[PDB]
Symmetry: C6
Subunit: 196 residues, 6 copies
């Protein structure tokens, strides 16, 4: 029965948003979690135990695997999803204490709106930042043969990845679902400015 | 005691459905989850660690396994089940905010119905889409010997899968339970049109 | 405090059953789950990683293991337990919406009974069906040496299973607890007919 | 607030027991679970993967491990603990429906007592039964060298177990805690008879 | 709202304790659990799979590992923490039924205090008992080389442990946090006697 | 509905803090947990199973791995996060019993403030202590080749770590998020003194 006070909190947090963003993005947050922790986490399980290279030099598979994967895509997308969720969480924690301050006033314009704008800016700005890093480093694909030239391997060794194509499809899903997230925040950002 | 408000929400979401779909499909959603995450998830555990090929060429088992399995059936069926559930979830989130908008009206035809129709269309349309992809790629069976002709293997190598018959039976269950899902949405789709 | 409405639902679902079936079968459902997911699931963990055969032919252990186990007993008994539980779940979901239809009637014989009979028939009929399949395929024991004659092995190879005796005892428990389930539904089936 | 009805159910189930059994056995049930599923389950993890024998005969470690362990002690003690708990659970489910039958009587001697006696008999009788089986099979110790004479091994092979002493200490705890359970039910059994 | 009855139970259990023990020991119970099941449980994961010895004698690593570790420190500290918690749990279960007996008296000195004294004695007495056993067996350190002289190894073999220094630091934490537990119960024990 | 009493407890614990620390640090506690147990725990999974050294000397990989990692970074950061959380937990448990003492007074300055100051001091003081230890031992990086000179290896051996660069990035995140924690407690510490 104590959900009646929670109804006031979920109303005031989304009083400035449209009728289409709170139904599409909230499902998109549930979608991105359920894709990440259930389907694709088990896919990157043997990212190192199957990585075989064509040499006898001991440790050459240790230093060549790292050059291909400075940071794996799974711990990348977990690093991304907290950074896109944290401006919403920070706005949620602030609006709760603001509501509590006003409940202890009545029994004995523009202040809330600025941080609501900033909360959607850093949602996109971190999202563009994590995309171009992936283009700068990994691209949006995976080749089935890597040629490695680090030390202490000899001249050039051939290292064969573990499931390039299965890792390819879940990369493009993480590109598309992030890109439809990015456009879905931009359309809110026009609506808050064009109101006046 | 706060389930009385939830009783109004579960009534309005299924006010257009028949008396037979909400009892058969809701159990079919519980059935498909319980078959997937409990029985058949452990069956595809060693999909790569048992895949042995008949060669000495290093990495030939890495590139030949991929040609047989571009995407494994388990991460396929998890990818399918979210896409069939998401039009129901999207209709659920929309009808909640529509109900909340009308609760803040009375204390101080055709609008809901169109998206209810669209919500059942994309349930079937994604379901037909995922079936024919499996026929285009994997078929509905698994052979116990795969002949591989990728690079850098030699001329032709023999690769032996891991449990073809146990993977065969759970494929046909995922075909049958998806097909009885597909017919169970079609029978609703006639009933909403033939009402008038 | 909202368990008072749940008290009406658990009364009407078992208004036709005896005083002895709802206390013995409900514990038997808790018993079969707790035996399956806690004790015997870990026993069939290394069903493939310990299966060794007496040959050098690569992949001969892959194709010979399958002939011994087309479907493992653990994923068999999980497949069985959902099929015996689903007619009870389907009767539970139907009787809830029937109760809700009558609650929206009073504020502004024989119909329920037929599907209650059918719900106990398919509990036994699926149970007899899964038993004879095991007799047709696996029997009710496990021998400690399997002789395999599939391809591409040579003439005949000896393959040694993993824990035949520990798998033997839990098979007989799954035979006995299923058989005492089968007789406990039959005794209900006489009581509903002999009432008149 | 709906724990007030649960207070009547936990009173009537233990109206015939002493003030010392419901405080000592209920903690003993919590003790035996917490010892089993947390401490000693991880100890029997590598019961097969460390079992090495002194031969080259392939599969000789498969058939010799079984003769030493027809059923492992962990799946034995899980099999024991359900059988000692099931007469208490069966008495709990029966006394609930008996209470419900009398609640639907008042708004519009000796019957309960017999099954309470039987419920404590089968607690001890199954407990004595599982103890002597262990004495008939395993004893109450483990030797660090097993001599195996099964087929298809040669004349006699030496097989070395995995952690005999760590498995020895948890056997004696499972003997002592079962024996203090057995005496704690007997002392109740005198008290119910000597009341008259 | 039914926490008001729980407020009476948590008051009467600690009516004889000081204002400093219920705030320091209750956090110390939360600390010792969170250190044990989260940090140091994963540290002792490969206690056997990394234990390598310097011989070819088959099974010599099985019988030499046991002499170094008759019982591992993790299953020791889990065995300790239940024994220090069980006198508090036994006093909690007794004081609940004592409270229930007096609630069924008013609607139609020295008795509680003795078992409160005994409950703190066996907390320390078991704690001193488990400490000196560790000094009698393991000491409070771990050496990086063990020399083994059991059978059927030859004259003397060198066995190298798995992470001695990481296991050293968590031993001293389990010594310090147990010792600050032991002094924190003694200071209560003076306060109950010196009251009179 | 019993969250109304919890509203008084969460008000009195933070009556001396600013409006910016309770919204930024509480999210920072949720951030550091979610980074630790989800993203970086799986990264340090094979910290030993991939550590290969360039020798044939048995056990040389056991004693050389330890010199590189006396305590792994994951069990370090878990050891850190409990020590920074424990002064907040201790202040939470104390303020609850202080509130309960005053509730049993009214139905029949400076005392709280001192321990609030001490609770923030030991948050920073333990945080500076764990940082400089890492600088004294590990630094803030990881090199891809370790040269080992322990016994019983020969003169000098080369040991290659497992993923130095992926472990490098999560170290700097654990430095930055700890450092922004350290400055966020200092800014509170000025505010409590400069109030008067
Ligand atoms: C009385 C009607 C108001 C009840 C509001 C409850 C909805 C808020 C919960 C939304 C989050 C649920 C996550 C599953
Ligand atoms: C690798 C396992 C992934 C499991 C899910 C990851 C959850 C991390 C994001 C949680 C954000 C919650 C914000 C409210
Ligand atoms: C060794 C060659 C250079 C490697 C640089 C890797 C940079 C990866 C940066 C990832 C940043 C993700 C968190 C913002
Ligand atoms: C009075 C202070 C309120 C702070 C509310 C949070 C504002 C948005 C913070 C966004 C941080 C973006 C970088 C991670
Ligand atoms: C009345 C609303 C209760 C549920 C709110 C849950 C989120 C509150 C913000 C989370 C951080 C607050 C610090 C405890
Ligand atoms: C009204 C409250 C204003 C809050 C200001 C916060 C602005 C963002 C500061 C942090 C940006 C850089 C974070 C890495
Ligand atoms: C030294 C070359 C490293 C190249 C990758 C650097 C990644 C740094 C990420 C910083 C993120 C800044 C977001 C505004
Ligand atoms: C007062 C009667 C109305 C109560 C309605 C409760 C039923 C709605 C819950 C259905 C989902 C339950 C999932 C297990
Ligand atoms: C591979 C493990 C499978 C576990 C179950 C998968 C659940 C994913 C579907 C959840 C959809 C929920 C919609 C309400
Ligand atoms: C390498 C030969 C071509 C492989 C193509 C594989 C296509 C798999 C498509 C799966 C799509 C599932 C998500 C819609
Ligand atoms: C006002 C907007 C309401 C939106 C409700 C959801 C409609 C159905 C969306 C189905 C999406 C199908 C493609 C995944
Ligand atoms: C009153 C109903 C509460 C339970 C509803 C749970 C589903 C609501 C839709 C889920 C998304 C809403 C965004 C928080
Ligand atoms: C009344 C609300 C209408 C909603 C329109 C949504 C139609 C579907 C658009 C997305 C289809 C393509 C998704 C891949
Ligand atoms: C390049 C050849 C790839 C063949 C498989 C392509 C699969 C694409 C799936 C698109 C789904 C569209 C659903 C309407
Ligand atoms: C060569 C032997 C192949 C065996 C295939 C067995 C197929 C069984 C399908 C079971 C489906 C049952 C539908 C209810
Ligand atoms: C007021 C008395 C009626 C309360 C009925 C509660 C019993 C129904 C629950 C039975 C299932 C419990 C599973 C653990
Ligand atoms: C292999 C792990 C087994 C875990 C338990 C299996 C549960 C499946 C049966 C659940 C049926 C629930 C019907 C109400
Ligand atoms: C390859 C030789 C024939 C194998 C047939 C295996 C049939 C197994 C049928 C199991 C059916 C279980 C689901 C009904
Ligand atoms: C009006 C329709 C009610 C349906 C209730 C369920 C009847 C029993 C179905 C049993 C199915 C057995 C085959 C799995
Ligand atoms: C009032 C009873 C609430 C609990 C009932 C739980 C089972 C209801 C049937 C489950 C399927 C209903 C579809 C949501
Ligand atoms: C009164 C409701 C009657 C329901 C009829 C259902 C009978 C069973 C039909 C399905 C049997 C075959 C399932 C494989
Ligand atoms: C082709 C030979 C296969 C032999 C096993 C067939 C099993 C089919 C199971 C069908 C179940 C029907 C239950 C009524
Ligand atoms: C109003 C006082 C009666 C409340 C009775 C609650 C005690 C019954 C619960 C005992 C089992 C608890 C298991 C943790
Ligand atoms: C091997 C893992 C053991 C986990 C605990 C086993 C629990 C089985 C006994 C449960 C009996 C519950 C009776 C109420
Ligand atoms: C192969 C030599 C005879 C082996 C007999 C093993 C008997 C084990 C009986 C265990 C019974 C436990 C359940 C009652
Ligand atoms: C009217 C029937 C009541 C049955 C209550 C249970 C009696 C005790 C059964 C004990 C079974 C012991 C063998 C497992
Ligand atoms: C009013 C008491 C509710 C809680 C009782 C939980 C145990 C009831 C017996 C369990 C089997 C009953 C079949 C649903
Ligand atoms: C008053 C109820 C009497 C119940 C009789 C049950 C006696 C035990 C019968 C089963 C004993 C054999 C089980 C293996
Ligand atoms: C064939 C020799 C087997 C020896 C072990 C038999 C164990 C049978 C257990 C039966 C339990 C009976 C309890 C009353
Ligand atoms: C009305 C005020 C009394 C409420 C008492 C609640 C505190 C007792 C719970 C202490 C244990 C909590 C463990 C997290
Ligand atoms: C090895 C995993 C350790 C997990 C925590 C162990 C908990 C055992 C102690 C629980 C005592 C509870 C007393 C109330
Ligand atoms: C084989 C040499 C003697 C080994 C004796 C080991 C004794 C360990 C006793 C541990 C007792 C812990 C529970 C009280
Ligand atoms: C009337 C009996 C009350 C018993 C309460 C518990 C007393 C303390 C028992 C401590 C046992 C210490 C040895 C484990
Ligand atoms: C009214 C208090 C309910 C919660 C008490 C939980 C502990 C009670 C003692 C635990 C053993 C009691 C046997 C069921
Ligand atoms: C007032 C209740 C007295 C309880 C007496 C219990 C004393 C301890 C007896 C057990 C000590 C030995 C346990 C191993
Ligand atoms: C036979 C030599 C064994 C040496 C270790 C014995 C440990 C026994 C522990 C008994 C604990 C007694 C506590 C009072
Ligand atoms: C090598 C062994 C070193 C042991 C040092 C620990 C001695 C006890 C220190 C903790 C005392 C705390 C008293 C409050
Ligand atoms: C009636 C309004 C007061 C309700 C206070 C609830 C907020 C306190 C909970 C904060 C912690 C939530 C963690 C998710
Ligand atoms: C290695 C797995 C990490 C899992 C999370 C660790 C949690 C430990 C910190 C919990 C502190 C809670 C304070 C309230
Ligand atoms: C073997 C060379 C000296 C190794 C010393 C390692 C010291 C590590 C100290 C870590 C302390 C962390 C807990 C405070
Ligand atoms: C009356 C005693 C109150 C104690 C409250 C806790 C004070 C802060 C303790 C901080 C301990 C720091 C070292 C871990
Ligand atoms: C009324 C507040 C109940 C919830 C408080 C939870 C934290 C209380 C302090 C935790 C230690 C108290 C010892 C049981
Ligand atoms: C007002 C309460 C004062 C509490 C004093 C606690 C001061 C800190 C003592 C412990 C410091 C050393 C811990 C390792
Ligand atoms: C013997 C050399 C060891 C060097 C590391 C010592 C670490 C000790 C940590 C003590 C922490 C004290 C915090 C105030
Ligand atoms: C030799 C290449 C080393 C690459 C080091 C990359 C360091 C990246 C640090 C990212 C920290 C971002 C802070 C927000």
């Amino acid at each position: 029965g104590d959900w009646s006070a929670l109804g006031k909190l979920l109303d005031k947090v989304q009083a400035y948003s449209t009728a289409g963003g709170k139904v599409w993005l909230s499902v998109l947050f549930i979608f991105r979690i359920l894709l990440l922790g259930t389907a694709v986490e088990s896919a990157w399980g043997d990212e190192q135990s199957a990585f075989r290279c064509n040499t006898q030099q001991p440790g050459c598979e240790n230093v060549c695997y790292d050059k291909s994967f400075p940071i794996s895509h799974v711990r990348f997308w977990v690093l991304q999803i907290i950074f896109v969720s944290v401006p919403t969480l920070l706005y949620l924690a602030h609006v709760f204490y603001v509501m509590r301050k006003e409940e202890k006033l009545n029994k004995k314009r523009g202040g809330l709106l600025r941080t609501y704008i900033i909360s959607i800016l850093f949602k996109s700005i971190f999202e563009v930042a994590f995309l171009l890093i992936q283009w700068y480093i990994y691209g949006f694909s995976l080749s089935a043969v890597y040629t490695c030239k680090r030390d202490p391997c000899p001249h050039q060794v051939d290292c064969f990845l573990s499931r390039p194509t299965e890792k390819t499809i879940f990369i493009i899903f993480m590109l598309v679902v992030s890109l439809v997230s990015l456009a879905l925040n931009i359309i809110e950002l026009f609506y808050v400015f064009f109101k006046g």
